[PDB]
């Protein structure tokens, strides 16, 4: 799940809706689980450690 | 209290991608070390930004890269260091009544005054502080 | 910032001595120990509110008897340590208007609650613990 | 020699400190000319050499 | 790792008895304040004398006033510090052969100079504070 | 009529037994109870706090 | 003392660059990252053997990323965490008689036993820690 | 100036004489000017920051 889009559709389908975004940053909220969580969008591939982190940060 | 630790993953077909562990759910990027510290600190505003503007909590800690560099979700990271006021990322503040010693004021606006800061910048900042040393 | 050192003299034929070498000027007693201890805070309050009626400058420094014990003048002296809240010595604070973040707010109000304190003392405590920071 | 409570406040008193405000025992006094507030305690006992220097300093004496 | 705080307490018929909580057992008394003091060193060094002759375990830890001022069992005690080289204390040192880098041995050289130590001096009471940092 | 004296022969009845002096400070040691204790002398009574810190040193 | 910080500069068309700003003249490189820490570590260890091997002195002093990161000359640097135990690098050590007292030997032995060090790893790393804390406390 | 090999040849311009290797570490000693110059060698172009350093440290 390295690349940015791929990332996204991920969290989309774990229910993570995206509520605002800044520049490149997308801001994803959900409505159970807690937390806000940014995603990098460059439509590129991500490293595998900041994949982990946003993974953890989703609750996947 | 305005210094966050960021660190830097790149794999062999990667860009840059940042995390900012103070801060939990920051994320950011660039195509160069360069973009992705520029990128990482609008990354910053905007969250914390977002959580203002829907009444969430912002919670952050303060970290050294010390503190940070040996947990195993940062292997092989590299680190760089951000700063941001996020006492100053409140569109909508409020205005509130307070009793200040006199004293008290008179020091604050001494300090103030020699400075770019303003009586409701330096209470805010100090709040923080002491707030975080509460948390410690 | 609200903890002070006090040195405490004796001479054969003298009551308990006391002096509180962070508020220059502040002097007490006591024919026991515990006489003592417990007249230096009033004194100390005593003092401070004398200043804040005369408009006076409150200046006090926050050290530790390690930084102290050697010094000269405190030559076979003991130590205590005395806990007073000088932020709530003056009778007539001033009413001022401050712009809050509604986030930093939200935690000086949860934090408050629990403790029985208010906005203002939060606030003025605050203060004085980042001019101190600010000088040492 | 001004280890008496009574003498010292005397002496401060000769030097032109003036008493302001008293705090049970507590004896706080201010000058016309010389900087600071001086708080002395008033035991009518002998008070340690030590603490007495120290009223003395703070009072430039 | 020299200096050791001790509380001395004192009840209206009592002379001054003295603890000295990082040494455990370690206690003094004085007919005065001065005495106490100075009887609490020699207390100390024949505390310590008498486990190295023994060959027990000597066991000591690094307070500082403030982190022991406020424990239940020194409530109304009133502090002082006393300096103590635990490492001179043994009148038949083991003598040892050790390999020390060059460059180390040159810096201890240069060092123990200027400060009238010997190396033996310096190594054992680097060796202390290295096994109290150890023990943190 | 001293605080020190009665103290001292608690200790000898619990089995503690001196082992060396220096001046004033009396140093002593168990067989079976751990640590090294040391009790002031010259016979005069000492305060209660240090009486009770000599106390749970030798175990009582 | 064992750990120093590293700056990694980085332009479009160079390989990664290291600096050690601890112990000066110490530089290094990498085509990545996880190359240039590698290489670092290296580079130290080369030039402080080549330091003692030439009898010059070793200066170093020990920084946190936090007091260098401001520097002009490390700016837009990323940083890195390197770990050398610098005593280990004299492969001539001189032997010496010291006297060490009873309690003190005791507690060296025990502490070692478990870390499978030695008196003289032991006693050199505690000096340079007592050297760096005499230098400014 | 960012050729590890024009770098390493101003450098022995300057008068600095490799004294050791370590695998691709070049280290560097002067008769006249104090102290150890290490120099990374992959023969490829080093960074305009660690280049600056190289020549601060050198003396250049």
Known sequence: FTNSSKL??????DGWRLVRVTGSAHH???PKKPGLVT????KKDLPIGTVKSIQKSAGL | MMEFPIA?????????????????????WGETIDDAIKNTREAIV?????????????????????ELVAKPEYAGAVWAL???????????????????????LHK??????????????????AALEALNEGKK
């Not at chain 2, 905007?46 to 010390?66: P, Q």
């Open chain 1, 39 to 42: 995603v990098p969008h460059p």
């Open chain 2, 46 to 66: 905007g969250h914390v930004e977002t959580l203002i503007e829907l009444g969430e909590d912002v919670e952050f800690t303060c970290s050294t890269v010390e």
């Open chain 1, 8 to 13: 996204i559709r991920m969290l989309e389908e």
């Open chain 2, 108 to 125: 604050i606006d001494a300090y103030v005054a020699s400075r770019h800061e303003t009586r409701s910048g330096f209470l805010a900042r």
């Open chain 1, 28 to 30: 994803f909220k959900h």
């Open chain 2, 82 to 104: 951000v700063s941001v006021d996020l006492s100053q990322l409140d569109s909508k503040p409020e205005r509130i009544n307070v009793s200040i010693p006199r004293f008290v």
């Open chain 2, 8 to 28: 830097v993953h790149k794999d062999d077909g990667s860009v840059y991608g940042v995390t900012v562990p103070d801060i939990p759910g920051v994320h950011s």
